[PDB]
Design a protein around this ligand. Structure first.
Ligand code: 80V
Length: 138
């Protein structure tokens, strides 16, 4: 498949706030999240099926480490600890399902796809809401 490695820059975002709202994030925290996510830095180091992904804004940094096909810990988009599994849906697209570590909640998932034109699309899902974030490589 194509190499996801590099520094990625946001060019288009749909329904990030809508997604946080259906997850019950309060309006003050949603506005901070939308402002922060307006200029993120995404660093991906891909070694075959092994991924390091660092997502940084001024207010929040996540670092995840996963092998496609092995369970790992991360957080949901609204910052709840979860156990995740990634699988390849195609050469170009990984899909991830998240189970909360404690309690129940809505079913959350993400997908990351490297398009034929070099765009990285992240989709994040909860209930009927689909958030799409499109990046280009710096
Ligand atoms: S892309 O890869 O650029 O997409 C992307 C995904 C998520 C984010 C983000 C974010 C974010 C920023 C601030 C906060 C949050 C998320 C929460 C978890 C929803 C809570 C509100 N909030 C804060 O309170 C500040 C940070 C924190 O939780 O400690 C960026 C880019």
């Amino acid at each position: 498949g194509p190499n996801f490695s590099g520094n990625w820059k946001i060019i288009r975002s749909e329904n990030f706030e809508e997604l946080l709202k259906v997850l019950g994030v309060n309006v003050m925290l949603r506005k901070i999240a939308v402002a922060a996510a307006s200029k993120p830095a995404v660093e991906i180091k891909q070694e075959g099926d092994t991924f390091y992904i660092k997502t940084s804004t001024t207010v929040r940094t996540t670092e995840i480490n996963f092998k496609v096909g092995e369970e790992f810990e991360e957080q949901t988009v609204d910052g709840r600890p979860c156990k995740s599994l990634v699988k390849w849906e195609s050469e170009n697209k990984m899909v991830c399902e998240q189970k909360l570590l404690k309690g129940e909640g809505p079913k959350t998932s993400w997908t990351r796809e490297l398009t034929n034109d070099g765009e990285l699309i992240l989709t994040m899902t909860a209930d009927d809401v689909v958030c799409t974030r499109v990046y280009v490589r710096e």
